[PDB]
JSON list of C-alpha atoms and ligand atoms in Angstrom, two decimals:
[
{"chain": "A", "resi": 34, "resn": "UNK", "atom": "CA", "xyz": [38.60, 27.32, 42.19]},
{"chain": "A", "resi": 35, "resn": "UNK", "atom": "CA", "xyz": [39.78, 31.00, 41.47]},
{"chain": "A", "resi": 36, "resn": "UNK", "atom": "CA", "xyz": [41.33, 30.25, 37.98]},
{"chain": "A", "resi": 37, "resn": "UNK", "atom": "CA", "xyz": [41.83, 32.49, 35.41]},
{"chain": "A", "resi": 38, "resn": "UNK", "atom": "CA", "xyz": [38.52, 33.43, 33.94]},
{"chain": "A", "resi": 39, "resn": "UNK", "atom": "CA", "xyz": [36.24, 36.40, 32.22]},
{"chain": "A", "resi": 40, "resn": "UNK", "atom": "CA", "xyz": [34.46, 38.70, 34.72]},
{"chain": "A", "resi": 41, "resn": "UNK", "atom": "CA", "xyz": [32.55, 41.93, 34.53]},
{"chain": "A", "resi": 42, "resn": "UNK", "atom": "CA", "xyz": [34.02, 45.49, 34.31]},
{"chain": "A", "resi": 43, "resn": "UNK", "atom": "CA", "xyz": [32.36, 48.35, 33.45]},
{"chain": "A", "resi": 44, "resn": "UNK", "atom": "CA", "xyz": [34.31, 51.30, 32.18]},
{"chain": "A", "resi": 45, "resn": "UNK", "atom": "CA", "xyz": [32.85, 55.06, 32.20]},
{"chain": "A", "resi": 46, "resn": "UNK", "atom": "CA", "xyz": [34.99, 57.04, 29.63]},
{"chain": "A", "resi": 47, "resn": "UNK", "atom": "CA", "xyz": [34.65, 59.85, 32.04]},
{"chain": "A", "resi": 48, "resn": "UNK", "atom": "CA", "xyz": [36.96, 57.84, 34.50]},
{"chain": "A", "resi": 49, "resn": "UNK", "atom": "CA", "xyz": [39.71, 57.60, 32.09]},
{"chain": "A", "resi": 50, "resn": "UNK", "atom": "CA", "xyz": [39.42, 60.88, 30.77]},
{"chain": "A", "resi": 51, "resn": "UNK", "atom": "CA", "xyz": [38.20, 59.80, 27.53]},
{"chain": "A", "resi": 52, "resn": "UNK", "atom": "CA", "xyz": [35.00, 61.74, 27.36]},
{"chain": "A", "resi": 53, "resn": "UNK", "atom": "CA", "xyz": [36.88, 64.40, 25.78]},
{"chain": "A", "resi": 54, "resn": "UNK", "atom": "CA", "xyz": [36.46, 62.60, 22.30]},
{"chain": "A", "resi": 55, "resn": "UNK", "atom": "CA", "xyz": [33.63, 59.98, 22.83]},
{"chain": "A", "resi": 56, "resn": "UNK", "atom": "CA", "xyz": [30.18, 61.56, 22.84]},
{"chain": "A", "resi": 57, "resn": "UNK", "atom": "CA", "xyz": [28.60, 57.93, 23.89]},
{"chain": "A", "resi": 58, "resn": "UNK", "atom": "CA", "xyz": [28.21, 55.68, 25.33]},
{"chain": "A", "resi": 59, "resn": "UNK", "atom": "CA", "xyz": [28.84, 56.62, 28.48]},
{"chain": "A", "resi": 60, "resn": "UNK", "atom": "CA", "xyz": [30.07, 53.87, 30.00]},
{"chain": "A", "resi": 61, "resn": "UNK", "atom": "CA", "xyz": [30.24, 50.45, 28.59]},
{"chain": "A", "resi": 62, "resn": "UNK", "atom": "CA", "xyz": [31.15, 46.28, 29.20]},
{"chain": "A", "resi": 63, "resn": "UNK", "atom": "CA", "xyz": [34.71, 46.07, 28.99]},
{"chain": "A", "resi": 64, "resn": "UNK", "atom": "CA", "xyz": [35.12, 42.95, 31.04]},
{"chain": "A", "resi": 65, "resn": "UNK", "atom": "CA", "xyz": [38.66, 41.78, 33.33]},
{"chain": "A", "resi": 66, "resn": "UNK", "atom": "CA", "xyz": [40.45, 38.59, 33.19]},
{"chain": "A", "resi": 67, "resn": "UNK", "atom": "CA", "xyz": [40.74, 37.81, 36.82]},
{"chain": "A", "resi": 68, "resn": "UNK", "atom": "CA", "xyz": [41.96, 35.11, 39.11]},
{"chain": "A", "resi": 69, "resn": "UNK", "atom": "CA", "xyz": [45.82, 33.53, 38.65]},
{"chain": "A", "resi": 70, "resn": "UNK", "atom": "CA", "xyz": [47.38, 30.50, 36.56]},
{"chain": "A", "resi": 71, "resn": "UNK", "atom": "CA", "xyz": [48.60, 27.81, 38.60]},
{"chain": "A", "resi": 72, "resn": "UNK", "atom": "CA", "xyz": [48.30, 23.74, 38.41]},
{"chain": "A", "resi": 73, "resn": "UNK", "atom": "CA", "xyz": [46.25, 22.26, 37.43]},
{"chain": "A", "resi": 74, "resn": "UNK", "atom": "CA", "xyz": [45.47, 24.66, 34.80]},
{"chain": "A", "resi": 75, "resn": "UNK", "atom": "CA", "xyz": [42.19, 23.99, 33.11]},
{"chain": "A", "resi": 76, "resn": "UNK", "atom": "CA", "xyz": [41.27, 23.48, 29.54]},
{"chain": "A", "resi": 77, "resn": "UNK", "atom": "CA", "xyz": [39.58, 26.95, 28.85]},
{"chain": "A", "resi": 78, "resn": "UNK", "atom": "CA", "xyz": [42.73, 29.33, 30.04]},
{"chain": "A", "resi": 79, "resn": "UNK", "atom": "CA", "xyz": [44.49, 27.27, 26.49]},
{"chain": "A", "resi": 80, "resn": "UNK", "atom": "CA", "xyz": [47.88, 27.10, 28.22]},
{"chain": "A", "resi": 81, "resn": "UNK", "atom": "CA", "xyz": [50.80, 27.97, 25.88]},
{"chain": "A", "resi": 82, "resn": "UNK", "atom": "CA", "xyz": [53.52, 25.70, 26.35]},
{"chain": "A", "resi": 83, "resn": "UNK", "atom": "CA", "xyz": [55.57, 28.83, 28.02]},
{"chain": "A", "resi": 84, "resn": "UNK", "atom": "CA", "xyz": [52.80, 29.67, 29.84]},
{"chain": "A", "resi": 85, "resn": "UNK", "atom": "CA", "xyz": [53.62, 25.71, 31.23]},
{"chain": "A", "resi": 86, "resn": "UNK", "atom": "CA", "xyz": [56.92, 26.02, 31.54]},
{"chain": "A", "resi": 87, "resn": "UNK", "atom": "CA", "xyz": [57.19, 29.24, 32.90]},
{"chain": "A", "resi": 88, "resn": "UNK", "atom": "CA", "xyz": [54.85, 27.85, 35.84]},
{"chain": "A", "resi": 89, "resn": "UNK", "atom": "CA", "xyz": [56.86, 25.32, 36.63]},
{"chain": "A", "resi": 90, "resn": "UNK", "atom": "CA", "xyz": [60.31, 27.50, 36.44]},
{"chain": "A", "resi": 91, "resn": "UNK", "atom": "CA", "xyz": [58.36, 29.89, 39.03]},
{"chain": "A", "resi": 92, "resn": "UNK", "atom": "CA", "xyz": [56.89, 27.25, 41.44]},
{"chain": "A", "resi": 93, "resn": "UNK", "atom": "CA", "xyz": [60.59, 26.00, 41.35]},
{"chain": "A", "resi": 94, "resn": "UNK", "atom": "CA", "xyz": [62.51, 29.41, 42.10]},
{"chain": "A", "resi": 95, "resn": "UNK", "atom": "CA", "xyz": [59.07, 31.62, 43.55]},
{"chain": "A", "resi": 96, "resn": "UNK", "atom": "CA", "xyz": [61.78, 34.93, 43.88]},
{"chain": "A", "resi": 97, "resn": "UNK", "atom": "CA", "xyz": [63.69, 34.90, 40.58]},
{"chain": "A", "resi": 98, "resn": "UNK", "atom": "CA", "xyz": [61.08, 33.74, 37.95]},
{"chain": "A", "resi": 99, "resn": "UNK", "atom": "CA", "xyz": [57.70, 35.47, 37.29]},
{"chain": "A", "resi": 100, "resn": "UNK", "atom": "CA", "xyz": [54.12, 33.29, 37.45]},
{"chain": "A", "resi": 101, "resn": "UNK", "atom": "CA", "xyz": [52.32, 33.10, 33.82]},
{"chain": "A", "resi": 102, "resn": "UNK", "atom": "CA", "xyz": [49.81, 36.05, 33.65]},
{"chain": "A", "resi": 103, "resn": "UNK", "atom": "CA", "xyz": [45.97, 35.69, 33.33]},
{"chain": "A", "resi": 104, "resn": "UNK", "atom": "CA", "xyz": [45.02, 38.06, 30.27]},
{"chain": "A", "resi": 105, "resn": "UNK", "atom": "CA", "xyz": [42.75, 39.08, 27.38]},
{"chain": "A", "resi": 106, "resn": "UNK", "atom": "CA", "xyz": [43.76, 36.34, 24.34]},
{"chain": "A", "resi": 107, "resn": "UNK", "atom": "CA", "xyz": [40.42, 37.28, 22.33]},
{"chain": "A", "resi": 108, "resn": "UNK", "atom": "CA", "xyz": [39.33, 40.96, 22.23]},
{"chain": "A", "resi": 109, "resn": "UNK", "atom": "CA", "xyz": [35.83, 42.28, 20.63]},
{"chain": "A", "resi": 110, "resn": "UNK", "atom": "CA", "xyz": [34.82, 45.90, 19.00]},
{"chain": "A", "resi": 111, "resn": "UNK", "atom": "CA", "xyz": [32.41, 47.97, 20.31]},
{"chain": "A", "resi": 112, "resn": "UNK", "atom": "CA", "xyz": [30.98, 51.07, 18.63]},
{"chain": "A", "resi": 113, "resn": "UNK", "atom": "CA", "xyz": [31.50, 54.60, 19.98]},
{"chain": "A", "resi": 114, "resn": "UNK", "atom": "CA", "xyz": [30.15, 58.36, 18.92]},
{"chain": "A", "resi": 115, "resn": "UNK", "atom": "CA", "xyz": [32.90, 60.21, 18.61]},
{"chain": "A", "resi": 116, "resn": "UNK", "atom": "CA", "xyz": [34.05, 64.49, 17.40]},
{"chain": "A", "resi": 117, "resn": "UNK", "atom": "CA", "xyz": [35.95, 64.03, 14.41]},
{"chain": "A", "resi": 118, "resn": "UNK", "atom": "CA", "xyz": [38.38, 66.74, 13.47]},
{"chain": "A", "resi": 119, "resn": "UNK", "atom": "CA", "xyz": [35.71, 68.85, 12.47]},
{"chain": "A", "resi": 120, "resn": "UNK", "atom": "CA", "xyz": [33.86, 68.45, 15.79]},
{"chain": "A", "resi": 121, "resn": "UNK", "atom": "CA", "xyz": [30.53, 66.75, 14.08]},
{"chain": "A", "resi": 122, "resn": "UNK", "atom": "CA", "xyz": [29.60, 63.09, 15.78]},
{"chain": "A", "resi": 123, "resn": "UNK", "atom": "CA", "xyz": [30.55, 60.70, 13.73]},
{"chain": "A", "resi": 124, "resn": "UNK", "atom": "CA", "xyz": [29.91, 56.53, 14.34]},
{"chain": "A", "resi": 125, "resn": "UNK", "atom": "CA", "xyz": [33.20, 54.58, 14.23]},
{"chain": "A", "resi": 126, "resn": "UNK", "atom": "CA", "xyz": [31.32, 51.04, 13.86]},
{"chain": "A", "resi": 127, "resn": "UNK", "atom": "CA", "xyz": [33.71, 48.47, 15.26]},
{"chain": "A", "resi": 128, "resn": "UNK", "atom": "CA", "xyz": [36.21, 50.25, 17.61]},
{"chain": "A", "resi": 129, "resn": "UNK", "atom": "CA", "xyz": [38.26, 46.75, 17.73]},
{"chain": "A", "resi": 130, "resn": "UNK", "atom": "CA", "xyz": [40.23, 45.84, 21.19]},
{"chain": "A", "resi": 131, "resn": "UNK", "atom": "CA", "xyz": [37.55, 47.53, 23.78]},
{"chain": "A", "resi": 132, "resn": "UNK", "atom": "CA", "xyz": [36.00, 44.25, 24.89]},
{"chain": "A", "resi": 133, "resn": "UNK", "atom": "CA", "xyz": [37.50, 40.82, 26.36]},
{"chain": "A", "resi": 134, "resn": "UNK", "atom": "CA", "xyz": [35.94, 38.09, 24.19]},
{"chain": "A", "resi": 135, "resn": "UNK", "atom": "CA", "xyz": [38.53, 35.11, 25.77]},
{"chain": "A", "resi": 136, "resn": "UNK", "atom": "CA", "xyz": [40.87, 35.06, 28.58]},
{"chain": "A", "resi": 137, "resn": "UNK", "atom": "CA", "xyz": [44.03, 32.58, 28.83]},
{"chain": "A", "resi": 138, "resn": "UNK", "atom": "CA", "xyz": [47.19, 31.94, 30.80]},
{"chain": "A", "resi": 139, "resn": "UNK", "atom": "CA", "xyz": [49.72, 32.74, 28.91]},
{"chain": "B", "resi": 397, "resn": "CL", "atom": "CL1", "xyz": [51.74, 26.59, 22.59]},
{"chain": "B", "resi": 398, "resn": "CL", "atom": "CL1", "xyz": [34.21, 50.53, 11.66]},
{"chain": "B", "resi": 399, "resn": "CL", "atom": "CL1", "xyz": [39.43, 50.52, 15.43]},
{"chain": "B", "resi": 400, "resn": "NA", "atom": "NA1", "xyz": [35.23, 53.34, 35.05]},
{"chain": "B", "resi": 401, "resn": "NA", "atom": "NA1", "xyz": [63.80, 31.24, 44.47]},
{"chain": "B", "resi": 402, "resn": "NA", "atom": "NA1", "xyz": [27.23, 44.47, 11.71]}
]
């Protein structure tokens, strides 16, 4: 198998040096697209017809032409407590762009 796909990955702000501004969560689902894009490409990666292409191009010259990339397509919010300028917690609702909702080849 090993296509490109959505897997876990959890992120603690502290890691990234984030917990300066978000009070909490701590940590939270992030998710990874993992795994590579190479034929046969299944339906749920939704090839672009680059993403095609640009396979081909690489299988034919491996050392001058890149492979297509397994990545986010589809991203979801999440909803953080956060110091505002003022320093009181305040809720930002949907945070959009934290969270892999769909992964592709593209
Ligand atoms: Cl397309
Ligand atoms: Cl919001
Ligand atoms: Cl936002
Ligand atoms: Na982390
Ligand atoms: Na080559
Ligand atoms: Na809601």
């Amino acid at each position: 198998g090993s296509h490109c796909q959505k897997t876990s990955l959890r992120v603690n702000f502290e890691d990234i040096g984030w917990d300066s501004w978000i009070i909490a969560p701590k940590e939270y689902e992030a998710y990874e697209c993992k795994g590579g894009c190479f034929f046969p490409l299944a339906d749920d990666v939704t090839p672009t017809k680059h993403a095609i292409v640009q396979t081909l191009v690489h299988l034919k010259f491996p050392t001058k032409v890149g492979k297509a990339c397994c990545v986010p397509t589809k991203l979801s919010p999440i909803s953080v407590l956060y110091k505002d300028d003022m320093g009181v917690p305040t809720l930002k609702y949907h945070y959009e762009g934290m969270s892999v909702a769909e992964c592709g080849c593209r």
